[PDB]
């Protein structure tokens, strides 16, 4: 009577195999706007609405460049900044600097990276800033806290041209644990 007891486990397995895809198609209807509703559609129609609704420039990277950027900042608890290679002034700083470094965007914008770091590194800072699509990476101190809402901020990025319309250093800066 062991063969029926093994086919019982196989039965429960093949039942879970179907009650899991029932969940994957229900959670394919309970999230898409096309079938968010009224009459509940059949399975094949939910799969067809998924095939179609998926089709918006999907053929790799799994993530729109800017979506990946926003999720990098929102996940690594970092911020993005573009700095100058001669003047050192920041030409753009993310909204993430108030969450991470406890400073408003104004206290960075217009200022330079030199006024914001620990001076005994600023010289080596120029080494990273001085150009001579290349990779740049450096650990550096940064003044943390001006009001409510010093730390180490590992900065990683690349040197590109500066097309404001559309050299500068574009970098993501995250605090090390």
């Amino acid at each position: 009577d062991k063969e029926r007891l093994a086919r019982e486990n196989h039965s429960e397995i093949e039942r879970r195999r179907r009650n899991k895809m029932t969940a994957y198609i229900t959670e394919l209807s309970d999230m898409v706007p096309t079938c968010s509703a009224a009459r509940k559609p059949d399975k094949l129609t939910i799969l067809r609405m998924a095939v179609s609704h998926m089709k918006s420039l999907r053929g790799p990277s799994f993530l729109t460049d800017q979506e990946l950027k926003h999720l990098i900042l929102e996940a690594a608890d970092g911020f993005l900044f573009i700095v100058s290679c001669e003047t050192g002034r920041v030409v753009y700083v993310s909204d993430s600097v108030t969450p991470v470094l406890n400073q408003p965007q104004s206290e960075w914008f217009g200022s330079t990276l030199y006024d914001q770091v620990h001076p005994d590194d600023v010289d080596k800072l120029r080494e990273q800033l001085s150009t001579s699509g290349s990779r740049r990476s450096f650990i550096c101190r940064m003044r943390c806290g001006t009001s409510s809402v010093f730390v180490v901020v590992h900065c990683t990025g690349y040197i590109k041209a500066w097309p404001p319309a559309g050299f500068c250093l574009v970098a993501i800066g995250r605090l090390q644990v």
Partner: peptide, 25 residues
């Protein structure tokens, strides 16, 4: 598919992500 078609809507119905267009490749 449940991951991808939920990692859009999330971005589709939401506010268009702030910031400039592709500062990094």
């Amino acid at each position: 598919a449940c991951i991808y078609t939920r990692k859009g809507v999330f971005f589709a119905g939401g506010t268009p992500l702030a910031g400039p267009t592709g500062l990094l490749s």
